[PDB]
Amino acid sequence: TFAKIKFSAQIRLETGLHIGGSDAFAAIGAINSPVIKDPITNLPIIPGSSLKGKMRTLLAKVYNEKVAEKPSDDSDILSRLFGNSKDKRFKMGRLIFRDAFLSNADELDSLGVRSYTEVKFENTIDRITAEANPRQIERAIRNSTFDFELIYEITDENENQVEEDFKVIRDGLKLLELDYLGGSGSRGYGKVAFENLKATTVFGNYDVKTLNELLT
Amino acid sequence: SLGVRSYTEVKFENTIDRITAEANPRQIERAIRNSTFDFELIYEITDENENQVEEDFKVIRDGLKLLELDYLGGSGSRGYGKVAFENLKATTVFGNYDVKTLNELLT
Amino acid sequence: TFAKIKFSAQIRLETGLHIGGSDAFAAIGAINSPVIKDPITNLPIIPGSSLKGKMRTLLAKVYNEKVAEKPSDDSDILSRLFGNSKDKRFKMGRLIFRDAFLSNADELDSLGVRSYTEVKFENTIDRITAEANPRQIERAIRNSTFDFELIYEITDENENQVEEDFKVIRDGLKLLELDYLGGSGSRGYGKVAFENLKATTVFGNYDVKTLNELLTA
Amino acid sequence: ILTDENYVDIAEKAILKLERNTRNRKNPDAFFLTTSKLRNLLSLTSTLFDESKVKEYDALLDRIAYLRVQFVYQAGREIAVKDLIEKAQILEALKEIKDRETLQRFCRYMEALVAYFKFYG
Amino acid sequence: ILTDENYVDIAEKAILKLERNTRNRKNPDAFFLTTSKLRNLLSLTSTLFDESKVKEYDALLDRIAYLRVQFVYQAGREIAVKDLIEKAQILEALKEIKDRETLQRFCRYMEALVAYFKFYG
Amino acid sequence: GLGIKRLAVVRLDVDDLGAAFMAGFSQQGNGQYSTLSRSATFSRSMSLFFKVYINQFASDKKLSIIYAGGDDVFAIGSWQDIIAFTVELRENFIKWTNGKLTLSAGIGLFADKTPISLMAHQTGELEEAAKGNEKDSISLFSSDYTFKFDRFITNVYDDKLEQIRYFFNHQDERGKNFIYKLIELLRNHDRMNMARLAYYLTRLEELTRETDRDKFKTFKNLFYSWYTNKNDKDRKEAELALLLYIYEIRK
Amino acid sequence: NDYRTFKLSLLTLAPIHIGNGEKYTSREFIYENKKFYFPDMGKFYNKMVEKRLAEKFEAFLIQTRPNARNNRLISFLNDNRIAERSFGGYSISETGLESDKNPNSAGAINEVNKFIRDAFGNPYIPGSSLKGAIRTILMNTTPKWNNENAVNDFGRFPKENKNLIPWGPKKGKEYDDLFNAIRVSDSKPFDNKSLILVQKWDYSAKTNKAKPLPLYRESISPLTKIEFEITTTTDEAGRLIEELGKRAQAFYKDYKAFFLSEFPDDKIQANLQYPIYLGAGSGAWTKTLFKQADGILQRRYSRMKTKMVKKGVLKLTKAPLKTSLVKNHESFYEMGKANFMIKEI
RNA sequence: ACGGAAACGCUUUCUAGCUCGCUAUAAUUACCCA
Ligand SMILES: Nc1ncnc2c1ncn2[C@@H]1O[C@H](COP(=O)(O)OP(=O)(O)NP(=O)(O)O)[C@@H](O)[C@H]1O
């Protein structure tokens, strides 16, 4: 039968994250690189495409025998989890990353946080002439949490590849912790931690009690 | 009234090569969050199918939990989905059929 | 093969530092040069960009033979540990200089600390007419330490580039103790110590027995 | 009491209401009050304004208690400052602070007083 | 007063009404007003223009009240900023904000002043 | 390898040819030139042009004339050699007709591997959107870039595009990021972007080196001049010129 | 590696005050032993509001009473029997020479200026203050930095050019910045037992008196060794910071011939190492280009407190006798006259 | 007994790479008031 598994987790930030929105021509003294933001509530957001693409390129460094020249050249362990534009059977592959929408706007407002983004002023210094050039880039503040969820579907075409996939999913989250996930991370942004790893079966009949202990 | 200039956002996005590590930008026009759209879905209880209406109601309804749990759109493996139905009521229009045995199976 | 290692350290300040902040809504007779600080705890941070652009330029005057004149003209020992924008294989640069947050807030609260950043008054004496120009610039206090994460990548391009880059990273850290992390520098404000250099692997398999000996050079 | 939509205007009409040199017709309309004795008043609250952002108000309010006595003692020395703290109801507004958003409005009101005194003269 | 159709033109014709350095022939027709006495004033309205896009107007009225203090103070220090904000009626544009739309209009006006200050000289 | 990998389709039509054939000669004289011989030689002229000389005009170019005759030219091909084809075709047709008989084309860009009816219908909509500009217009690639040909071939394609190419090849500092930020300020364009453009180009005037600074000053005093022109037939041309220059230098 | 580090050693002959901006008022100390106790007055008012006497305290603060030993918050505590003095701040021992009157006047000092202190609470000398002492020795003893450093006919003879010494990023040029290349460190934070609060004693020429002032800054005691680190990253900077030994002697030679003459030599100290004038109380002529500010410095004073004719009043103090540094009687030091010796490491 | 019946504009894709909030700057001057 057809089943689905939902992955509740809190993406708690450290060294607050930058996921860029428009490179459109800013105002004169305004923020130069703004973070991506929700249109209704104007909170920060992590799109599911960043969580998918960064984890795709991180797991492409672990679960590929041959170095992939392109995402279609990825492995069969990864094409079934992230989809493949060229395989006939691994097109639309078994994971639906969703966005994340700043769950604790009340915990952060219980503390003395004025706005849910900070703006760090910053500059570059030329090698000759040592002449400064400032930027103002925006980043979602440090103690945020984000409601993360995946919808892993089980379509009976695997039948034993289910628990092989969580050794890839949990490995990918463990890599996302150690890598940065988003924007200028070599200057130390991003640095996400994953909390409250919880698998629930929202459709079908599948038991996840042997799966949460893999998630610990 | 919630304060917005358009009903469609423009999400910027890119594609990064695995070897060259060079980006490839994109502007994808998404509809904004919590836009609420109309919905109706005529089911015709014709003459022949009278014994099998309720086993075609546990399939219409079961196909809506799936749209709440799958994405319903394009490029939905990267977000862009998560569409939840609400006020899912079943009224009758042009007929003599009693829907007070169905509206409790829906909610 | 893939590995990912981590460098733990403590940025002990010695005559503590200024890393300039942002607000225009400051005051009239109070701090007009704020320090960068964490927006929720209001504790000073050492942002990783100010670590990176000091190590990137202090090692540029050591390891670049030809003088750089621009970034991404670095001599491929710096271009791969930091990253160019223009080399096709050196876009990313295998070092992640995470930000640094003030660790020993309770140790500073054991000492008689009124507030975690001091304010320093610094007028400019006009060398004719003797008149002044007071600035009130903020700096994190003297015995503050900062947890310094540093994460390094080891892919299948490091045939023997691993242990070569660690006579480079610790070289840059012992050059940070001779320079000043931004601020004034020429007026104090920068001297740091790097304490408990402790390398370890956070992902994969790598033997850091031979790495934890040249940290203590 | 001073609130957000009016404290700058209260400061403006305060500075216009300080009396001047009625005699001494050498550059007239000059205040009795000077820039130094007013920046000595702003320097009392300039520390508390930037200790208010970091610290809690409940771990801070003994300085706000003593700062009333500071304004009293700076008033009880010169008649041009005892005049100021009664034209602008400084002592009346020190008692009604009671949180952070009025501490950072009083310490901002003193900045408004200095700004309009610098603007006129 | 400034409206949605003419706030850029007033900032154009107000830089042209600001008097320049008539004497001191070393790149003449330079302004008495310097760039960094003008980027400080824009440094307030730029960080209100970026907070007005998110936060509601009934949460920014602590900073909008202090723009009225800072323009007054910076004009009281140097005569060139006084000659700016009296030529360009900035203190009479700060009197009329009242919502998000006129706030962002004023914050774009303050940027158009700087753009035309950079463009001329 | 420079050049975007697109193919264009152009559809043409001589504007008001039946009106130029029946009435045609009735204005000069007093109805004394309105014979059958004038219309027969006129038919031979138009037939000679659209059935003989279009193959001369399509000689070196990388295209395909899918139809030519009557007064239609429907032609697919490479987009440099479609825009060059139609500029050449009209600049020969207005020499052929002494400047009478306006023609009005629609060019549309399409990626590779797109179906030909989905291509031809969107070209024909641009052709009819250029019929109703006033009458005589080329409709480059979209419903908005709709220029009179005398306002296109002189201004856009020869004056502005060669000035943009001449500036952006005799330097190394300014790149495609600058061109993209000019295209944004040209496309949005309220009154505020005139001030933002005046700030942007003045920032970059004092950022270029002192070797190439009068070169940049004679470009920014030339771009800001038409940006703030207040005739609207000079700002829209610059956007199409910068689109063509970005399409020329695409990797 | 052109980071040539030095090691300056600073011996204070005269009392040296630096900084902090703030100042204790007339009613913010306690003199009951032979020490001055400067409490945290916030904790004072907090612990005294238990005594139900804060309104009598507010009466004491505006009390315009004579006999100044009863005004200085000692008599408030002795009369109203507050005797715990368990409050915050600190204590410093006396100079012993502050009250000139042997009739009682004990603790009748009025307004002391604080010393610069870190947030731990310990005094130190900031490197930005020692660099301003280095920079005037470098400016006056370099003849190319003294010619046009002046008005250029702008306002009220207003200000330094700030551009004789070539400073900037300077777009299109290389990077010199000579004083970016002279990197002065803050000192080790020394102890509270080095502070004495000398008063002030202005000693005039053409009227041989030593009228004292109500300005009693918390200065460092004389003969206190304080260490500094200076790194010079440019060889051009290395030459100046090596030649400071010649340049400080040359500065003091050109300054004694300009200013210390017309004053009697008994009140004037001898060097004993290389001379330097660290801040707050050395006079204007040690902070300026003294041979370029002769008609330009006194122009700023059309007030009650003008500079007398030209080359203003000498700034002596009274700290007790050590080694001997003083050379005369009655303990007239020079308030900022320190010395140094340098060596490369 | 509807140019109609059946048909997801869908799959893949990190807004990314690089970049010191930096440069110069003694909390100092004047010595007096009742
Ligand atoms: N040489 C010619 N002599 C006479 N008639 C011609 C000639 N060539 C073409 N025609 C016909 O002239 C007519 C013009 O068609 P069409 O171009 O649709 O109308 P029009 O006059 O151009 N008005 P418009 O379509 O707006 O330009 C067509 O029926 C052609 O077949």
Ligand SMILES: [Mg+2]
């Ligand atoms: Mg036609």
Ligand SMILES: [Mg+2]
């Ligand atoms: Mg036709």
